[PDB]
Amino acid sequence: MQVWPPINKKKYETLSYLPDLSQEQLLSEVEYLLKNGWVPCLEFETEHGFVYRENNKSPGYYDGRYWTMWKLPMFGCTDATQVLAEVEEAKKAYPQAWIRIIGFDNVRQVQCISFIAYKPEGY
Amino acid sequence: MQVWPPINKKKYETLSYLPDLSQEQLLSEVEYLLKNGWVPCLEFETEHGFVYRENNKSPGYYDGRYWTMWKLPMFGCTDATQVLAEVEEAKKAYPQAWIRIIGFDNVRQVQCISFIAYKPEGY
Amino acid sequence: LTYYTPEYQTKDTDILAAFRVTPQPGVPPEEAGAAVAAESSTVWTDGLTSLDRYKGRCYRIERVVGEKDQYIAYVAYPLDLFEEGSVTNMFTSIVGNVFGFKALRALRLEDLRIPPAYVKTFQGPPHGIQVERDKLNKYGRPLLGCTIKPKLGLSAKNYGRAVYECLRGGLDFTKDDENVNSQPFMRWRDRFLFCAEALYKAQAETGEIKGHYLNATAGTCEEMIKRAVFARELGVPIVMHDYLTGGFTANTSLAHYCRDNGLLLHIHRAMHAVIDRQKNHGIHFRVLAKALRMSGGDHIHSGTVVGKLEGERDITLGFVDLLRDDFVEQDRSRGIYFTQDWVSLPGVLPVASGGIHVWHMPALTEIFGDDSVLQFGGMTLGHPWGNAPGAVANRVALEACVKARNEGRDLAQEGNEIIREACKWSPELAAACEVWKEIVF
Amino acid sequence: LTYYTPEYQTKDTDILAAFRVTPQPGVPPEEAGAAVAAESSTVWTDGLTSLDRYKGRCYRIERVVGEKDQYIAYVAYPLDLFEEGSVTNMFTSIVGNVFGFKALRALRLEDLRIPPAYVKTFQGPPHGIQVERDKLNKYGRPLLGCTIKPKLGLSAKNYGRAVYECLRGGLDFTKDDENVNSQPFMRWRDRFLFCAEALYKAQAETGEIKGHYLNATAGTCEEMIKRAVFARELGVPIVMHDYLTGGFTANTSLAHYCRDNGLLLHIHRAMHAVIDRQKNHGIHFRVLAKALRMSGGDHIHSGTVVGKLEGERDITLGFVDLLRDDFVEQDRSRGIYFTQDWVSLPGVLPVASGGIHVWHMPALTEIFGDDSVLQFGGMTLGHPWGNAPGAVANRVALEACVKARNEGRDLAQEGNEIIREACKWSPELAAACEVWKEIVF
Amino acid sequence: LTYYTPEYQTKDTDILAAFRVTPQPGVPPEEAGAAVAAESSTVWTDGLTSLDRYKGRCYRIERVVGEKDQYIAYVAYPLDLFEEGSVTNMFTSIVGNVFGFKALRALRLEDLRIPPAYVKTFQGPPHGIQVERDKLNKYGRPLLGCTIKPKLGLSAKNYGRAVYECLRGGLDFTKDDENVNSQPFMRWRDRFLFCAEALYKAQAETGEIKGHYLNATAGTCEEMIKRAVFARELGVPIVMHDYLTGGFTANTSLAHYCRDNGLLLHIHRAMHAVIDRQKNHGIHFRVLAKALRMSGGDHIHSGTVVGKLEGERDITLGFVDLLRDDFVEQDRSRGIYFTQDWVSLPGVLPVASGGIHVWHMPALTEIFGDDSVLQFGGMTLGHPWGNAPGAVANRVALEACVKARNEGRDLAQEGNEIIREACKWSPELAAACEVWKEIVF
Amino acid sequence: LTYYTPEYQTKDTDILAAFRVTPQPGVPPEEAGAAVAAESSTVWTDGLTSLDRYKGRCYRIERVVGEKDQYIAYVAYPLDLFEEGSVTNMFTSIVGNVFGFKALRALRLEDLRIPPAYVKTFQGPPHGIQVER
């Protein structure tokens, strides 16, 4: 019988309960986005890695949902590698940042995918 | 004439004004629960050892009342020693945690007992 | 005497009353009992309805053993006579007129059986025992309250200072005097504010939830609600009301308010001795206590057992059970005339106060057990080292007792010893025990 | 016994109390009186203020003539102890705790001197005697009320039918039983509506203003206000409240409501006998009556004098004066322990009820005079010809008495004769008088 | 049979209904279908208007293949018959009377075509799928809910403890039982408060937004709104309602309330089986689902596909599409009788529950895809290691499935394998899989 | 089938239900009746309370005369299960889920005994017959 730790198990939504994605796993995910025709986009954050409620506490209001856009959504990119590259670019630049990859389905105007691509030391 | 210190006298409810329970005192308490047929259960916390009010301040609302469950309530346990064991288990694992033993009276569906079994260094 | 009906088979929905009657010389019991019932419930208009449907009826007499001129007359009242959710109306109907019946020397209501079909029309306590321990996160020991003295003349800021000192020492609650409402020396809003400042500070310091019973008793319902409203704005846990002086109508309004806003309600029994002291005339405190549990309150001052004969301690315990438990089986030894089923209406925590000292801790624990609040005045405030130390003294005394009990010690046989050992390691306790140590040791 | 201060010079702003004390064997009077005062008003916090400023003090003892173990202890309480406009608080402070003091066998509060500086903090009666006669346009004779019986079980529509029959016969008011609030057999809104229909019809028929005391007594303040609100919407003149069962906090709220909306308030004294019957213990009805005049009510049930010894009739008249007049000089013969100045707070109309018959009319008129309401149950409802005729009977009986009195006749010497002559020309009256005529004539 | 109009050309604004009719032996179909329409919509007053304008009309019959006595009668109702924004009124008009028509053995409503001109009179879901993922910041996978068991008898504080344990493990939502409203064992305000404490703690711990469906279902609209008001004060994300037992009128009020205050609304379908189970009589769940999307709810319990034959899985998927999509083309294979255009009314997330186990994860993912909530009772609570681990188990199982799918694996072919590999690195998952591993491996 | 309790003595405060049950071929009545009661009312949380206090219980079965596959199963529900003054809640609790129980071919609720202790929590008719006339 094991005890799930109440500390140090911070999560990041989809796929964050699985073992860290490997370069190939990452790539596979990027390709899926591509197969379905979603537009990949990187987002990063250095201060508030998690949701909080500073400005307001009414229903549905949370701070920290939005992260910073890394460059622009990657319209027309066709090579899941371009994407991985950017990730690489982003971590060199902000080794302390949390980096996630997101995908837009503009036909429905929704974010259809969002997973963590890199976490800073200790996360 | 002595002055009760306004600092460093943090408490933990029942029995926290007595000298720290000894292994035997602890055991005696566990046995009482057992004699009355309450179900022992451990709970621990590593961050907020005390009640606070972050999310809300309406009457009766406090944060920090709930702690994490250590394993499951110990249904049918018959040996106060099993319980002490778990405590031991819990401190090795979270030496920084506050650990308390609680007892359920399900006939009345109440917590009929709750005392601190171990405090981290400096408490 | 169409009102004396020994053949009568009480119904599950009947309200039953046990009246202690002292008839006027000459008048037979049966006539006695039939008169209690007759204008305790009930021409041509008479034929427009059915007497038999709304009449109280004395279905039973009993001679009080020992005494002369006393019986226990048992009266049954139909459910329909009563306005749902109204203790005011139960009281008007049962005790409104008969106490002045010529033919009775004296009358005393001793008990009432509130049927489940009437109990279900009341909200009862805003929270009740279980909910309160859970909201306060306090389990395994009686709760401790401190009484702020003097009763009148303290300023709002000095009130809060004594409140903070007393709480930071280990007590769970502080209490406004039943008399402190709003006065020239201390207006209520000022008291509420300062007490709130003081209880938060004591909470932050000790790490334990604190409460101060803020008295909302007032001249009018509007003013009483206005006071509970500010306690709600301040985010504090408990308010207080003098249910007999304020009255059942107001109390029921405040208990609803408390339920709707999450506030615990501490009830003070001021004025009760005016009605419940005399053994031949009045209303026994157990009836006043059932009425409070019905109207609503989370706590109720029940007296002390300290220096009470066993027969008395027993009557007390009978009404404690009636306050806290779900079902109480009839038991005349303890003054329980009817089996009372509360059909899950929350229980009320008995509040013990009046001359309690730390060396009384073992017995109190013993008698009341964990579900009670022990209140101290002179024990805290009166300690040689001030309120905080005074507070430690009681809190360690209480904890020593619980631990002992938990270890299998006999509190009744070893009280003095347990206290005495604790004094060995609690200076605070030691200071509180010196005059007692000299007399017993 | 820093609480017994015979040197003390009461202040104009003091609240004074006269307690009838029956000390425990052994304890001296002075100690008695000092204990009444000591925890009837009042450590280190003690030095944060001045005891002397907020202490009750027994400045006088008196041995009760005749009796054994009884004194009259006179206590003075500072104005500052009391919350302005709060009868609840006056009561909590004075009678909250002492009735249970170990050292007293029994205690009875007999009187209170309410200083003008405290009286001025109360609204008092919504209207009072003078305003009510003027609003009703009734001058020169006691007012007549009819009691609707049975007490419970009548339907809303039958209630109103009896109300209309009784009013159209010459009575000014009809009264809801103190127990009728809202029940399965008759919900309040239905009663209010039907009674309103019935009183307007009786008003239109006779040409005289009518009223029905609509009971607003309820479980909660909100519900009580909701009932008075509908009476206001219906445009009727008077509502009713059971001040002791509802409680002072609610009553004060309803009396304010009445003032603000023009409604007269009829007060019923249900439950009083529980507290004011026993001569050694409790609160004398005169104290309950001053409290009502302070909290507010335009009418108050005061009992009957019918078959009361003169010493009793006297005590009654003492509290009648206290209810109606502006200034009442101290008078122990009548049970007036303090001179009471009401500084123009309106007077309350005493309501006499309980076994009144037309042949009692002469005496009632005589004893109470014009400023009273005489209430009849069995006299109206119980008349051989029904409510209306029953009503005529009382109204002519009353009018015969007033005329006689006005002509210089002695009601005390000629009562029977006056009644008897009226019977000659009032069949209705004749029918009501037959059993009496046989016994006396 | 001026009601059977095969020539009829439905209008774009018509409401069309597909009724499954089982006529009484003897009565022809055409007569059948004309009777459904005749008193499903419709003397001299008749000539004061135009029948033809407000009549339902059966413009088409169809013999049900396989069965005996069954047709599919297609009825058209004019837009004007319906009160804008009222599902209550759509239901009264269509299903109010015909189910009791003598001449029918049984009748079942299978589908309704809600025209765009009527859809636009409804608010629809307070938020809908897209808005909810964005408010919760959850994309790319079905949402996970935990069911707190037992269904009744848990205390408010134990409720929250199980809520916190279940959420901190990886589940997005916890759910109040549809039966938990406010009861003696757990009053609603206490539950709301404790659950709020528990969901914030689990949110703070994991870094992921959490929600607890707080049930606001109540006896009256006022009480239901009063409960959502406190959820709003607490700042929580979602409330819950039992739309069929509460009723459409209340649900529409709560859905508006939610829109106006930012709360997501989770709908429970309690009682549906009373109406939608029997294949010959009632209202098919797809009609109950369109009505919910119209009245409003952000989530709706739709059953489980676990162990359902493909023909059933298909009918289910048909109503899932109707709940989530903007336009659904007619498809009898899936039980879609009319093409339904939702003109941008938000979509509702289907909630799958009932006996789901981790080894069912692959199929559920597969069948429902990302826009669904999977709810587990026994899977969480029933895990050998408690709620948290139970929660991890499901969350890793779900994540394994999504990843697999994302990698191009066939969930239908490799379900067991994917699960099984995950067990290799999730103890928690491993513990949940042991009885299954033995049977399949 | 700790839910079939023919020994059970209904209480004055119980809510009783008479269900007309048409079991699936194979399943005995007693099992039938125990299933109506089991998820018509009711793990570790289970031990945090008392099952026995909040369980519906089938204290009686009866074969419908004439018919095949039909019984009248009598279920007792504790007063505490119900929110005072809420017909919505009485309905959710009794008829909320069982009509869809796999094991039943069909179920029909025929009657309910509303105890006086629950009736008193309702206002009932705004006026009623007598007042209206």
UniProtKB/Swiss-Prot annotation, chains A, B:
The keyword Transit peptide applies. It is found in: Plastid, Chloroplast; Cell junction, Plasmodesma. GO terms for biological process: defense response to virus; photorespiration; reductive pentose-phosphate cycle. It comes from the Eukaryota. GO terms for molecular function: ribulose-bisphosphate carboxylase activity. One of its GO terms (cellular component) is plasmodesma. RuBisCO catalyzes two reactions: the carboxylation of D-ribulose 1,5-bisphosphate, the primary event in carbon dioxide fixation, as well as the oxidative fragmentation of the pentose substrate. Both reactions occur simultaneously and in competition at the same active site. Involved in antiviral defenses. Heterohexadecamer of 8 large and 8 small subunits. (Microbial infection) Binds to tobamovirus movement protein; this interaction seems required for viral systemic movement. Belongs to the RuBisCO small chain family. The basic functional RuBisCO is composed of a large chain homodimer in a 'head-to-tail' conformation. In form I RuBisCO this homodimer is arranged in a barrel-like tetramer with the small subunits forming a tetrameric 'cap' on each end of the 'barrel'. This is Ribulose bisphosphate carboxylase small subunit, chloroplastic. The gene is RBCS. The chain holds residues 58 to 180 of 180 of the full protein.
Curated annotation (Swiss-Prot), chains C, D, E:
Mg(2+) binds at K175, D177, E178. Substrate binds at N97, T147, K151, R269, H301, S353. Pfam families: RuBisCO_large, RuBisCO_large_N. It catalyses: 2 (2R)-3-phosphoglycerate + 2 H(+) = D-ribulose 1,5-bisphosphate + CO2 + H2O; D-ribulose 1,5-bisphosphate + O2 = 2-phosphoglycolate + (2R)-3-phosphoglycerate + 2 H(+). Its EC number is 4.1.1.39. One of its GO terms (molecular function) is monooxygenase activity. This is Ribulose bisphosphate carboxylase large chain. It comes from Nicotiana tabacum. The gene is rbcL.
